[PDB]
Amino acid sequence: EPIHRVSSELCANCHEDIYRQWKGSMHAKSTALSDPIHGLFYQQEVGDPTAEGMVHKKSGKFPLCLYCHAPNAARDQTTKLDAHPAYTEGVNCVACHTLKTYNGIQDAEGKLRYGIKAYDLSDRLQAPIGFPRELERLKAKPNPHLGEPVELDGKTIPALTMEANPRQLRTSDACMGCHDQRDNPQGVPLCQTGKEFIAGGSQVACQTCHMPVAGGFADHSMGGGHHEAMLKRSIVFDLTTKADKEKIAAQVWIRNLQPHAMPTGAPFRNLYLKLTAYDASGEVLWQNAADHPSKDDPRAYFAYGLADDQGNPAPPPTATKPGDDTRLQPHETRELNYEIPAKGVALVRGELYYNLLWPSLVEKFTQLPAELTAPVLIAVSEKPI
Ligand code: HEC
Ligand code: HEC
Ligand code: HEC
Ligand code: HEC
Ligand code: HEC
Numbered sequence: 001e002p003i004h005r006v007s008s009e010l011c012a013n014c015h016e017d018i019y020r021q022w023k024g025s026m027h028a029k030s031t032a033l034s035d036p037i038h039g040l041f042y043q044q045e046v047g048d049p050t051a052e053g054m055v056h057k058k059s060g061k062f063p064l065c066l067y068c069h070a071p072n073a074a075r076d077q078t079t080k081l082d083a084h085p086a087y088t089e090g091v092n093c094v095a096c097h098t099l100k101t102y103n104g105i106q107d108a109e110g111k112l113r114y115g116i117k118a119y120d121l122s123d124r125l126q127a128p129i130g131f132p133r134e135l136e137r138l139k140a141k142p143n144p145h146l147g148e149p150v151e152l153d154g155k156t157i158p159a160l161t162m163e164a165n166p167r168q169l170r171t172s173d174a175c176m177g178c179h180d181q182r183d184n185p186q187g188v189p190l191c192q193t194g195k196e197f198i199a200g201g202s203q204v205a206c207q208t209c210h211m212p213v214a215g216g217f218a219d220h221s222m223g224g225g226h227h228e229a230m231l232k233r234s235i236v237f238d239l240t241t242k243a244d245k246e247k248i249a250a251q252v253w254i255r256n257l258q259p260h261a262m263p264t265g266a267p268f269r270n271l272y273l274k275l276t277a278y279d280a281s282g283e284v285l286w287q288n289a290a291d292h293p294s295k296d297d298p299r300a301y302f303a304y305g306l307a308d309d310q311g312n313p314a315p316p317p318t319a320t321k322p323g324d325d326t327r328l329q330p331h332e333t334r335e336l337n338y339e340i341p342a343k344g345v346a347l348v349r350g351e352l353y354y355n356l357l358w359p360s361l362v363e364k365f366t367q368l369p370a371e372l373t374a375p376v377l378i379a380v381s382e383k384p385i
Contacts, residue, residue, distance in 0.1 A: 003123055003160070004072045007085040008092045013139050013152060015093075021220040030069045030090035030284035031081050036368060037356065038069060045081075045317075054079040058317065059185070067115030068178040071095040074116055091178070093159065097125045100165065118177030122163065130164030139286075172197075175206045179265070186320045188306055193264045200330025202259030209258075225269060228376060231354050234258060235328070237379035239275075239350040248340040248385060250275060250348050254330040256282050263302070263327060267316060267356045270294075270303035271327075271378075273350065275338060276385075280346035288338060292359050300334060302327050303358070345385045352379035 008028070012019035028319045029035045033051035034040035039049065046063045047054045056063050066074040073079065079285055081087045086094070100122040105112055131146055142150040145162035154358060180194035189195070211218040215311055236255040241248050252273060256262040263269035272293040277286040287297035294303070305323030308314040313323060323369040328334055340348065352373035355362070362373045 003096050003125065004075050004098055004121075004294070005084065005142070006094050006160070007088040008094075009085070010157070011093045013157070018217065018220045023224075025220065025222050026224070026226055027091035027096075027222060028089060029046075031073075031088065032065075032069070033081055033088060034090060035302050037372060038065075040365060040368065042069075045285070049079075049081045052078060052080040060174065062325070064114055066183075067117050073115045075121070094125070096174070097127070098122050098183050099168060099174070099177070100126055102176060103176065112181075112183060113177075113202055114182060115178050118180075125160055125162040126168055127162050128164075128166055128169040130162050132164060137179040167270050170205060170207065172206050173381050179206075181194075184306070184316055184319055186318075188265045188322055189317075190306075190316055193260045196264060196330055197261040200259050202330065204259055221254075225263065225354065226372075231376060231378045234262060235352070235379060237381055239348065239381035239383055241348055241383050241385065243342070244339065246342050248277070248342050248345060248348060250277075250338045250340055250350075250383075252336045252338070252350050252381075253333060254328065254352065254379075255330055255333040259330050261327045261329055262324075263354065266356075267304050267306070268361060269357070270301065270355050270358060271301040272302065272353050272355070272375075273336065274353065275299075275300070275348070275350045277340045277345045278347045278349065279311075279344045285343075285345055286340050294359060298326070342385075348383045348385060350379075350381045351377060354378045 008019065008022065015212060026035065030038070032039040042065055046056055046065060054063055055061060062074070062077065066079065070081055070087055070090060071306065073081055073093065078087070083174060086092070095116070098121050099116070099119045101120040103113065103118055103120065105114065105118050107113055131143070133146070140238055142148045142152045142157065142294050144157045144160040147159060147161060149159050150157045176194060181189060182191040183189055209219065210222050211220065213219070225231065234257055236257065238253045240251045240253070243249070252275060258264070261269060273288065274293070275288040276284055288300055293300040304325045304327055306314050306319030307321045307323040308318070309320050311321065314320070355375050356372060
């Protein structure tokens with residue numbers, strides 16, 4: 001009966017195109033039931049997503065994950081995510097479309113309020129325009145948003161009452177409760193897409209890039225790191241070479257097209273550059289990094305780490321200080337210079353790889369689907385010599 005427990009399948013009766021986009025997105029796959037990466041961490045940090053009364057294994061509190069990953073379950077104070085479509089559907093139509101007023105993530109006493117807790121919620125759907133039809137009433141597909149139930153194809157559709165809310169729906173208020181920041185228990189940022197967005201100074205709403213008008217309405221696919229086309233668009237990558245004595249001076253230019261860091265969001269996202277010089281038989285003559293750049297060429301590893309009081313790497317739950325951050329900064333163009341011995345080199349090839357998880361985690365959790373965990377080739381540049 002309450003709007004937040006209405007299944008996305010009901011909406012799909014009249015918004016099939018948006019439904020199709022949404023259903024394939026990580027928003028629809030956000031729960032520990034549907035995303036095996038999040039599920040592995042949820043099991044380790046909280047417990048079974050098919051159990052009621054679960055708490056965080058350290059804090060003993062209602063699991064904070066759910067505020068962002070299973071909003072309608074958190075709205076109903078339940079941890080049993082398989083009990084109802086409102087919970088299995090993750091960040092679903094009504095989860096986003098019942099957010100009314102964004103209060104910010106930090107309250108006046110400094111308490112962090114995540115996900116649905118950063119908002120006043122409505123029992124009415126919230127829309128960018130709604131149906132401002134008072135003038136038409138004053139003068140005087142089926143639409144269930146006009147104050148009454150409607151019949152569709154012989155089936156009664158309940159009233160799905162709606163309010164216009166342009167400031168919520170058209171600005172970053174639509175995203176920030178879940179995407180601004182998340183800190184560990186010592187206050188260290190884990191995710192910090194909002195602080196990055198502030199620092200970089202952009203005035204573009206997340207939707208302008210992430211909900212583009214295509215085919216005449218706002219695209220709900222909202223792909224990021226799970227979507228290779230988006231990742232290839234997300235940077236400009238180029239390789240230049242000049243002669244330099246008996247070396248080849250190779251310049252790798254990487255421009256971040258985003259107003260947040262690249263890669264933003266989860267702390268384990270990372271990129272790395274492989275730059276390789278080959279002879280004319282295709283045999284390797286030189287490489288920037290023999291194996292993984294994190295170990296062999298740190299300037300070519302673009303990542304965030306956390307640290308202990310000593311500055312040394314620490315697991316995210318116990319870290320007390322940010323570690324180094326070599327990710328591309330908002331709208332940054334990074335130049336990396338290499339000096340390659342020229343003898344026999346016929347081809348210099350640069351490759352930029354994106355990864356959902358740190359290599360430590362990929363090496364450990366080898367039962368995760370290999371399609372998830374494999375490096376993603378997101379840019380290539382070749383120069384013949
Ligand atoms: C038909 C029986 C519908 C059902 C079921 C739902 N909606 Fe709807 N919606 C309907 C119409 C005819 C329209 C107008 C435009 C169109 O697509 O033909 C809408 C519009 C919306 C909007 C946008 C309003 C705006 O600002 O322009 C939203 C945000 C919306 N609808 C959401 C929504 C949700 C979340 C649903 C399930 C809970 C849902 N609608 C069902 C018709 C029908
Ligand atoms: C948050 C991640 C959302 C989810 C999940 C869904 N919608 Fe959405 N929708 C959202 C925003 C912020 C906006 C406004 C975009 C802007 O910047 O203007 C919308 C818009 C709609 C519309 C209007 C589309 C248009 O006329 O171009 C409709 C009809 C709509 N949304 C419906 C809808 C349905 C049916 C969903 C589940 C399948 C759904 N949305 C999920 C934010 C989010
Ligand atoms: C265009 C100028 C953008 C604006 C405005 C914002 N984002 Fe973005 N974002 C953009 C691209 C091209 C990509 C792909 C790169 C990628 O890493 O996937 C992204 C990606 C994200 C992601 C995924 C990050 C990851 O794990 O790799 C998220 C969570 C994201 N963007 C969020 C986001 C939010 C909340 C925004 C407004 C504050 C926002 N983006 C603006 C391009 C653009
Ligand atoms: C909480 C209720 C959210 C709101 C509101 C928005 N997003 Fe979201 N987003 C959320 C989660 C929990 C996740 C990850 C789920 C998982 O298990 O991986 C996401 C993910 C994204 C992504 C990345 C998609 C990918 O390919 O991995 C992007 C680009 C994204 N979200 C964008 C985005 C925008 C632009 C929003 C406002 C319009 C928005 N999200 C709202 C949780 C929530
Ligand atoms: C909102 C403030 C969130 C809270 C609280 C938690 N998570 Fe989350 N998570 C959130 C978003 C917006 C995203 C997408 C980030 C991006 O870069 O695109 C995520 C992602 C994850 C991931 C990665 C999932 C994947 O790549 O498929 C994991 C492993 C993850 N979150 C786990 C997790 C757990 C275990 C939480 C509670 C302890 C938790 N998250 C909370 C937003 C939010």
